Amino acid sequence: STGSATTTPIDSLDDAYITPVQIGTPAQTLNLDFDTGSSDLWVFSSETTASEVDGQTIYTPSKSTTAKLLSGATWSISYGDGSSSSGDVYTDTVSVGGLTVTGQAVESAKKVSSSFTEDSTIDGLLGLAFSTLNTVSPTQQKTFFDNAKASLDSPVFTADLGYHAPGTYNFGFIDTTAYTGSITYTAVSTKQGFWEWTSTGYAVGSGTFKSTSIDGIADTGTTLLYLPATVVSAYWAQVSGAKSSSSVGGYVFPCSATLPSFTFGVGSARIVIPGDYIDFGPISTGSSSCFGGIQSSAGIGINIFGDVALKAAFVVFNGATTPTLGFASK
């Protein structure tokens, strides 16, 4: 049992990636934002407040013959976004790329934040962190990957995000076709329930590599690269005009400037993010200030390797008891 589904950016900035998943019987196709930094499968639904759904496709549990109320079961999630979602919960058959899982917990939103309502391309989330994080009460649920694991050929999914382009999520196998050279695997701490790992240093452009341990999370659900104040300061110091703004709330640079690449260390390996991935374009329409894709971790308390870093690598989340994280060049 394997599964491969195409993931597609929702905008030309690649703010997020959406993958079609099939829920219910017969199937309802929803486009979900695969989030390795949460643990809840949540969807817009027939129960979602009608003043909170704006062109999103809803899951109607009443048309699924596989769908069943988990009586008493309840969810509430809160992101670092400040994003919120909550409601009640169903079990149902869920298929990703032809990999089918029955009795998946499908948490139906009665309530959703502004941030989600505004985002017409996202029909909900598929959380791919560790199940410890999952929110449902009073009985806590498992994640789709955890539900599939035993069925899979290998208990593993890979992430292959595209820059301005589709890519792929594969389940159950490693497409040796899709990367260059060798995969470097590195230790994962599950202790906070994140794909949490420790990077071995960094280089800015064609500079010297600094060996320094940077602890943070692989998160396909976060757009930007979030690194300590020290490292982020070194990066922008290399771009004439870049400064941290109070107003806009992070580093900006003159759109006419030239972003140096950013190198991160995975073991004795190195992954270069091209300076082009670091461009998030004009902070406002018309503006000649442009938003940087590397920002300070100082106010989140965790360093996040978000889509800007992951899109530059072929990433394996080995979910094997001793979980590991692999990086390859692509």
Partner 1 sequence: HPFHXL
189 assigned to active site: no
Establish if 91 lies at the interface with partner 1 (CB under 8 A).
Answer: no
Q: How far is CA 15 from CA 10, 141, 223, 240, 281, in A?
A: 7, 28, 5, 25, 12
The footprint of partner 1 on this chain (CB under 8 A) covers a number of residues equal to 28
Name the segment binding partner 1 (CB under 8 A); options: 127-135, 136-144, 240-248, 253-261: 127-135
Q: Which of 1, 6, 8, 13 binds partner 1 (CB under 8 A)?
A: 13
Q: Are the C-beta atoms of residues 130 and 140 closer than 8 Å to each other? A: no
Lateral strand order in the sheet of 303-305? 269-273, 262-266, 196-204, 210-218, 303-305, 225-227, 294-296
CB of 79 to partner 1, least distance (A): 6
Minimal CA–CA distance to 104: which of 60, 55, 156, 42?
42
Establish if 224 lies at the interface with partner 1 (CB under 8 A).
Answer: yes
Task: Pick the catalytic residue from 45, 95, 199, 296.
Answer: 199
Instruction: Between 174 and 309, name the residue whose CB sits nearer to partner 1.
Output: 309
* Number of other CB atoms surrounding residue 268 within 10 Å: 7
Establish if 303 lies at the interface with partner 1 (CB under 8 A).
Answer: no
Residues 6 or more apart in contact with residue 106 via CB below 8 angstroms? 23, 41, 42, 43, 59, 61, 67, 89, 90, 91, 92, 94
Instruction: Between 50 and 118, name the residue whose CB sits nearer to partner 1.
Output: 118
Name the segment binding partner 1 (CB under 8 A); options: 55-63, 204-212, 218-226, 230-238: 218-226
Q: How far apart are the C-alpha atoms of 270 and 190, rounded to whole Å?
A: 23
Instruction: Between 17 and 314, name the residue whose CB sits nearer to partner 1.
Output: 17
The two structure tokens encoding residue 273: 């993010």
35 assigned to active site: yes
Chain residues 58-87 in contact with partner 1, contact rule CB under 8 A: 77-81
CB of 62 to partner 1, least distance (A): 29
Q: How far apart are the C-alpha atoms of 237 and 111, rounded to whole Å?
A: 43
Task: Pick the catalytic residue from 4, 14, 33, 35.
Answer: 35
CB of 148 to partner 1, least distance (A): 19
CB of 38 to partner 1, least distance (A): 6
Instruction: Between 34 and 202, name the residue whose CB sits nearer to partner 1.
Output: 34
Q: How far apart are the C-alpha atoms of 127 and 317, rounded to whole Å?
A: 13
Active-site amino acid positions = 35, 199
Which residues of this chain interact with partner 1, rule CB under 8 A?
Answer: 11, 13, 15-16, 33, 35-38, 77-81, 125, 127, 129, 133, 219-224, 280, 300, 304, 306
